[PDB]
Symmetry: D2
Subunit: 268 residues, 4 copies
C-alpha cells in the first residue's frame, strides 16, 4: 500500500507532538510520503519535536509574515527535494490570534491591529503560501488548510471565527488559481483537538465564564457526533487530511471536508 | 495496496456499463473489495453487464419497493458471503422519477402519486436499506448514497430535486442509527454523468426548451469547476465513493462530499 | 398605517387559538388585511375559533389531499371576494405527520405509506395550493409557507424533518412559477411554538427519552437566541409572516426567513 | 402609516444619489424616520447630495478608521438628537477595497497591507460602529449592514469576497452583544446595484477579461432571479433594509436577508 506513495508534501505548522500538522505528517510517512516541513520562531524546538517521526526529513524556516521566506521558499524546497523535482501536496496548518481577540476579552475590545495580525496569519497566508508553492507543484496536486466551522457563531472563539470565515473564502479563490496548475485546494474543518493552541485559549481564560461555556461547547461535539468525537485523538483528522492529499478525492476543490464525527450535521 | 483491501461491500443500482454503481464497483475491486450486488427488474440484463468487472461476484434481486427483498436481504447477503460474516460497506446508488415529474412536463402538473413513487425510491429506500443492512455491518463500516446538489433550484430536474432534498435529510437521520453500530453514512453529490438515467431525461424532453436549458446547465459545470468537469468520465465520482467506503475519512458522517470539480463552490 | 392595507390574503391551516395561522390572521387584520380562510376536517370547530378575530371573514373547506377542493378553490375564493377580484397573498400553514414517523417511534420503523402521507400534506400541498391559487393572484403578490430548519438533524422531529427538507426544495420551484405571475414565494422557519401540533408530539411521546431530549432542544432555542426566544408567544413569527405578505421585502423569493431570535445562527 | 414612524436611525455611507445608503434614507423618511447621517472624506460633496432627500437632517464626519470619531460619535449623535434621546436603528453601509485586490489585478498579487485596509473598512468597522452606537440604542433596536453573498467564489470580486465573508461572521458576533441591549443585528445581501463603488471596479478593469466576465455575472442575476432583477433600481434593497429597521421582523438576528430577486436560490 502507501496512500501517499512516493508523493512529496511540504507539511507546515508543527510546534509539538500533538500539533495537528504532526499527526498529518506521521500518517503521511506511515504512508510513503516524503516531507519537507516548515516551522515558525523556535525552529530548534520544532526541530527537536520533528525528530520523533518515522523517517527523517528537511525543515525550513517559515514566518508567513515576511516575504523573503515567501520569496525564497520554492528555491529552498526544490533545494530540499532536488531541482527537476516538484511538490505533490501542501499542508497549510498554521493559524494565530492575539489573546485580545479571544476567550474572555470582550469581542468589542479587540483592536484592528491585532485582528489584522491573526487574519494575516490564519487566512491570507493560505494565499501567500499558494502563490509561492504552486509554481512547483505537479498536475494532480493537492493543497489543504485547516478549518473550524466558522459558519455559526459560538462563545470564546470570537475573532478567530472571523478569520476562519475569511479562510473559507480564500480557499475558494485559491482553488481558482490552483486549477490552472491542475491543483486541488481544500480545508478540513476539524472538530476540537487538544493542542498547544487549544490550551492557549482554554488556559488564557481559565476561571471566568469560560473554563465552562467552552467546556459545554467541548462536550457539545461528542454529544452531537453520531459516531462520537474524542478530542484526545488527532489521527482521524490526519487521515482525513491524508485522504485529500491522496488521489482518492480527485473531483473535489474550493471545498471543506468536515472531520468532526458528524457533529456539524446534528443539532443535538 | 488495496484501499478496500479484503473489505466486503454490497454495491446496488447497476443497470449498464456507465451506471455510476458500475465504476464504483470496478474501482472497488481494482481495490481488493469483495462485492455482493443488487439489481432491479431485468436481472438478466444487469447480470449480463455485471459479467464485465475484474472479478466475479454475487447478484441478488432488490426491488426497494417491496419488503420481502427488504426482509430477506441480510439473510441472502450472509448467504452470499458466509454466515459469521458481515458487511463492511454499503453503496446505495438507486434513484428514480416518473417522467411526469421532470424535464419539460410542467412542475405543477406532476401528481402526488408519481412524486410519492420516486421519493419512495430515491430517498426513503436509503433508510429501508439501512434498516436491513445495518444489523450485519461491522464497527468501522460505511454507507454511501448518491446525491445531486438539491440545494438551489434548477431547470428540468424538477421533483428529483425535491427527492434529493429529502435524501440529504434522511441521510442525516440514517447517520444517527448508523452511529450505534459504529457505522458512517454519507452521500456523494456528483456533478452530472452521462448515464442511462441522465438520458432518460435528456431524451424524454429533447427538442423543447430543454435539449438547451439543461445543455447550458451541463456546460455550466465544466465552466464553473476550477479543475474542470468531464461528464463522460465516471471514475472520479467512483474514487470519491471509494474514499468514503475506505477508512481514510474516519471522522465524517451525516455528511455530503461534493465530487463535481469544485463547481458548487463557484458562481462562475 | 396598515401594512397589509386593503390587501386580500387567504390564510389556511387554522385549528385553534394558538395555531400559527391564527396569529398571522389576527395581525393580518389588525392590519387592514382582508382574509378568506381554509380549514380541514372539523370545520365547525375551526369555524368556532375563527369567530374570535378582529373582523369577520369567509371560511372554505380545504382537505389538501383531494383535488375537488383544489379544482374548485379559486372559484370559491373569487366567489368569497367577488369576481373581478384577485388574491394579494396566500398563507400555507398546514403540515402533518402520522404519529409513527415522529417522537419516540424508531426512525426505521415508519412505513413509506405514512411518510408518503405527511409529505403529501407538509410539502407537496405547497405546490398544489400554488397551482390553484396563482391564476387569481395580482402581480406583486406573496405566498408564504411555514418552515422548521430541517437543515441539520435533531431528535424526535424524525420524518417531519425529512418533509420540511422537501418543503424547502418545493418552495424553490414554486418561486419559479410564482415569478411568471409577478409573485413572491417564501417560507418562514419559525423557532418552536406551543401549538396543537407541538403537543401532539410532545404528548404522544411523554415519559420516554423524549419529555426530555426535546425538552433540552426546547431550552436550546432561548439559550442560543441572542435576543431570546419565548415559545409561548406566536406573534413575532406572525409579524415575520406579515412582513413577507407586505411589500417591504419586494426583492426576496425562493427563500427562507428565520424567525427564531437568531438561534439558528448560533452554536451556543 | 409610517413603517419607521418617529424612529431615529443614523444611516451612514452616503456619497452620491444612487449610493445604497441614499435610497435607504429616502425610503426611511418617506417613512417618518428621523435620520442622523455620516460621511467620509469629502463631507462637502456628501453634504451637497444629502440636501436632496425629503426632509433636512444632521450629518457628522465618520472615518471608520480613526477612534476619535468612534470615541465621539455617541456624544455627537445625542447632540444631534438631544440628550435623553436614543438611536432606534443603525445602518452600516460603508465598504472599501484598494483597487489592487479586485477586478483584473491577479488575486495572488494583492498585498496584505491593502487587504488589511479594506477588511478594516468593510468588516471590522461593523463591530467598531456597534461598540460605539449600542450604548445609546433603545431596546427593540435594529442594526443593518450591507452584504454581497460571499458564499461561493466569483470573478473580479476577489478580496472583497473575502471581506464580506468576514462581515457575515462579524455580524454574527455583533448580534450577541446587540442582544444584551435588546438589539437586532443583520445584513442584507443585495443583488448588484449600479453605484459609485460598482463602477470603480467595472471601470478600473474595463477592457480586460472583465467588462465581460463580470458582464455575464451581471446578466446572471436577472436570468436567475425568478421575479427578476433590475440593477438600475435601488429601492427594493432599500425597502428590504427598511423592513429590518422596522419592527416587522422582530424575531430575526445574526442573520442575512437576500434582496436579490431570488437569484441566490436558483442555479439557473
Ligand atoms: N485543535 C483544534 O481543535 C483545531 C480545530 C480546527 C482547526 N484548527 C486549526 O488547525 C491549525 C493548526 O492548529 P493546531 O491545533 O495544530 O495548533 P498548533 O499550536 O499545534 O499549531 C499552530 C501552528 O501555527 C504556527 N504559526 C503561528 N504563527 C505563525 C507564523 N507567523 N508563521 C508560520 N507559522 C505560524 C505555530 O508555530 C504552530 O506550528 C490552525 O489553523 C487551527 O486554526 C485547530
Ligand atoms: N448521472 C448523474 O449526473 C447523477 C448525478 C448525481 C447523482 N446521481 C444519482 O446517482 C444514482 C445512480 O444513478 P445513475 O446516473 O448511475 O443512473 P443509472 O440509470 O445508472 O442507475 C439507476 C439505478 O436505479 C435502479 N432502480 C430504479 N428503481 C429501482 C428500484 N425500485 N429498486 C432498486 N433499484 C432501482 C435502476 O435499476 C438502476 O440500476 C441515483 O441516485 C442518481 O440520482 C446521478
Ligand atoms: N409550532 C412550531 O414550533 C412550528 C415551528 C415551525 C414550523 N411549524 C409549521 O407551521 C405550520 C403550522 O403548524 P402549527 O404549529 O400552527 O400547527 P397547528 O396544529 O396549529 O396547525 C396544523 C394545521 O394543519 C392542518 N392540516 C392537517 N392536515 C391537513 C390537510 N389534509 N389539509 C388541510 N389542512 C390540514 C390542521 O387542520 C391545522 O390547521 C406547519 O407547517 C408546521 O410544520 C410549526
Ligand atoms: N452596489 C452593489 O451591487 C452592492 C451589492 C451588495 C452590497 N454592497 C455593499 O453596500 C455597501 C454600500 O456600497 P454602495 O454600492 O452603496 O457603494 P457607494 O460608493 O454608494 O458607498 C460606499 C460608501 O462607503 C464609504 N466609505 C469608504 N471608506 C470609508 C471609511 N473609511 N469610513 C466611512 N465611510 C467610508 C464611502 O464614502 C461611501 O459612502 C457596501 O458595503 C458594499 O459592499 C453593494
Ligand atoms: O482554530 C482553532 C480551533 C481550536 C478548537 C476550537 C474550539 C473548540 C471548542 C471550544 C473552543 C475552541 C483550537 C485551536 C485553534 O487554533 C488556534 C487558536 C488560537 C491561536 Cl492563537 C492559534 C491557533 Cl492555531
Ligand atoms: O439524480 C440524477 C442526476 C443526473 C444529472 C443531473 C442533471 C445535470 C444537468 C442537467 C440535468 C440533470 C442524472 C441522473 C440522475 O438520476 C436519475 C434521474 C431520473 C431518473 Cl428517472 C432516475 C435517476 Cl437515477
Ligand atoms: O413542524 C413543526 C414544528 C414544531 C416545533 C418543532 C420542535 C421543536 C423543538 C422540539 C420538537 C419539535 C411543532 C409542530 C410542527 O408541526 C407539526 C408537527 C407534527 C404534526 Cl403531526 C403536524 C404539524 Cl403541523
Ligand atoms: O460589495 C459591493 C458589491 C457590488 C456589486 C457586486 C458585483 C456584482 C456583479 C459583478 C461585480 C461585482 C458593488 C460594489 C460593492 O461595494 C464596493 C466595491 C468596491 C469598493 Cl472599493 C467599495 C465598495 Cl463599497
Amino acid at each position: 500500500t502507501g496512500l501517499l506513495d512516493g508523493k512529496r508534501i511540504l507539511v507546515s505548522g508543527i510546534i509539538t507532538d500533538s500539533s495537528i500538522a504532526f499527526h498529518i505528517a506521521r500518517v503521511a510517512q506511515e504512508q510513503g510520503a516524503q516531507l519537507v516541513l516548515t516551522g515558525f520562531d523556535r525552529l530548534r524546538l520544532i526541530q527537536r519535536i520533528t525528530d520523533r517521526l518515522p523517517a527523517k526529513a528537511p525543515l525550513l524556516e517559515l514566518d508567513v509574515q515576511n516575504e523573503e521566506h515567501l520569496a525564497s521558499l520554492a528555491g529552498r524546497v526544490t533545494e530540499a527535494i532536488g531541482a527537476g523535482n516538484k511538490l505533490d501536496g501542501v499542508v497549510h496548518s498554521i493559524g494565530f490570534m492575539p489573546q485580545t481577540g479571544m476567550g474572555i476579552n470582550p469581542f468589542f475590545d479587540a483592536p484592528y491591529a491585532d485582528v489584522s495580525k491573526g487574519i494575516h496569519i490564519s487566512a491570507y497566508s493560505y494565499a501567500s503560501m499558494a502563490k509561492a508553492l504552486l509554481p512547483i507543484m505537479n498536475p494532480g496536486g493537492s493543497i489543504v488548510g485547516m478549518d473550524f466551522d466558522p459558519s455559526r457563531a459560538m462563545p470564546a472563539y470570537n475573532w478567530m471565527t472571523v478569520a476562519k470565515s475569511a479562510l473559507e473564502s480564500v480557499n475558494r479563490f485559491v482553488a481558482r488559481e490552483a486549477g490552472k496548475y491542475g491543483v486541488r485546494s481544500n480545508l478540513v474543518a476539524a472538530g476540537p483537538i487538544r493542542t498547544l493552541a487549544m490550551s492557549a485559549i482554554v488556559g488564557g481564560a481559565l476561571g471566568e465564564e469560560a473554563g465552562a461555556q467552552i467546556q459545554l461547547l467541548e462536550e457539545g461535539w461528542d454529544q452531537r457526533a453520531p459516531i462520537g468525537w474524542n478530542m484526545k485523538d488527532a489521527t482521524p483528522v490526519a487521515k482525513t487530511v491524508c485522504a485529500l492529499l491522496s488521489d482518492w478525492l480527485p473531483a473535489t476543490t474550493g471545498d471543506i471536508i468536515y472531520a468532526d464525527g458528524g457533529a456539524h450535521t446534528q443539532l443535538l
